[PDB]
Structure 1
Amino acid sequence: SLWRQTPDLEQLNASQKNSIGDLLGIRFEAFDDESLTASMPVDSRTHAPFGLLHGGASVVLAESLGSMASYLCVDTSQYYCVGLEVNANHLRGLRSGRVTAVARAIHLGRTTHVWDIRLSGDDGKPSCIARLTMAVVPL
């Protein structure tokens, strides 16, 4: 019940067609009343030159997830949402498998949303934490 629009995973995934999220293999995986989850492969598409997951790729995942979450929480006939501020601590390096991100709301205001996004590799250890501020903008 965080959501205004009920998350439809197929449509979330489909909507990424011809964008970076599709290019990187980001997949919306699960949701509940308080969270939305997506994962992303750790391979050549997402590696930095030394074969570790690129820190910016973590942020593509987090910002893709957070911005999508914001879209599910506004009146889309009245508003759209763009990223305003993003930050992240890179905690542990990942070489293979997938990285999984979970987004939860810190604050959903009238003009801004703040999302807490937690990332971990397939061993379940925290790999990155991000905070995303979205701007809520009238068309």
Structure 2
Amino acid sequence: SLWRQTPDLEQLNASQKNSIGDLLGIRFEAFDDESLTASMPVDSRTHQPFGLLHGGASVVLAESLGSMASYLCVDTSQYYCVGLEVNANHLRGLRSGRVTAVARAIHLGRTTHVWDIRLSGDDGKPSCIARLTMAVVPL
């Protein structure tokens, strides 16, 4: 419904080869008519030096997810999307397991998109909330 290109999880995952998403183990996991979901491990790849998930790593997941969501909503023969502004509140710390992010659209304008991204650890409690603004740019 939201999407122009039907999300293809194998393709989304494969496209991360030789980029930070592959390095951190980001996995696109699910989608429906209103949302796209990806998760990331909480381990030495994504920890800060004190053994907690790095707040920046939460932002990598959020921006990977939202950037991919934008790509799936534009005419990619004419436009590309790049991150313009990002913000996040770090709500709860995580030490292990996986962190899961779900992106939903706030506004898909002609020149900007705004995404709402909610993250939680395996206990299901909110761990981070992010908002991402993407610029839509002529190819």
User: So what's the TM-score if we normalise by structure 1?
Assistant: 1.00
Runs of 4 or more consecutive aligned structure 1 residues displaced over 4 Å after TM superposition: none
Within-5 A mapping of 1:24-103: 24-103=24-103
The Cα shift of 1:112 comes to 0.2
Aligned mates of 2:2, 2:17 — CA distance in 1: 26
Per-residue CA deviations over 1:72-97 (Å, capped at 9, x if unaligned) read 00000000000000000000000000
The Cα shift of 1:48 comes to 0.2
Other structure's SS at 1:60 match: helix
Aligned mates of 2:14, 2:59 — CA distance in 1: 21
- Show structure 2 runs of 5+ residues with no match: none
Other structure's SS at 1:38 match: strand
Aligned mates of 1:115, 1:67 — CA distance in 2: 9
User: So what's the TM-score if we normalise by structure 2?
Assistant: 1.00
Aligned mates of 1:18, 1:107 — CA distance in 2: 31
- Show structure 1 runs of 5+ residues with no match: none
Other structure's SS at 1:13 match: helix
Per-residue CA deviations over 1:59-112 (Å, capped at 9, x if unaligned) read 000000000000000000000000000000000000000000000000000000
Aligned mates of 1:127, 1:27 — CA distance in 2: 18
The Cα shift of 1:47 comes to 0.1
% of aligned pairs identical? Answer: 99
